[PDB]
Amino acid sequence: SGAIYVGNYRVVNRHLATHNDWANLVWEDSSRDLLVSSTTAQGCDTIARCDCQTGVYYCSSRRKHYPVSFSKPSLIFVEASEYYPARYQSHLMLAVGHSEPGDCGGILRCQHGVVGIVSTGGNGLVGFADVRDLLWLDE
């Protein structure tokens, strides 16, 4: 559960995208687990334009926000799921912290804004799909 709303855009996990998201599709990237779609109401979230490696993420399965140190966006191997076969997912950031499948979509933030969304997890690790490079979300 969870999405980012910036201007006339809505970013979600591509594996959790709805029929409306696909019928108003702007861009989608299987290797990043991302999909952006068109909205009529204007969004108000600020996206970060930085290279921080500390922030705060929201965890639905614990109803608690947590502070984390996280890695730089890179190619990490992700286990086969009902949505994708075993593959390398690009632009992924890892941190020590609790996550369960229903937690995908929770936002990661630093003092500059929205950094990304929960996208992978397991064994006491949590993975975030980076969004700071998508400069067109602001224009």
Ligand SMILES: NC(=O)[C@H]1CCCN(C(=O)C(F)(F)c2cnsc2Cl)C1
């Ligand atoms: N980005 C991916 O390929 C996702 C697809 C859905 C499945 N993915 C997961 O990691 C998970 F839901 F099983 C999970 C398990 N414990 S915490 C999380 Cl998040 C990978």
Ligand SMILES: [Zn+2]
């Ligand atoms: Zn930052």
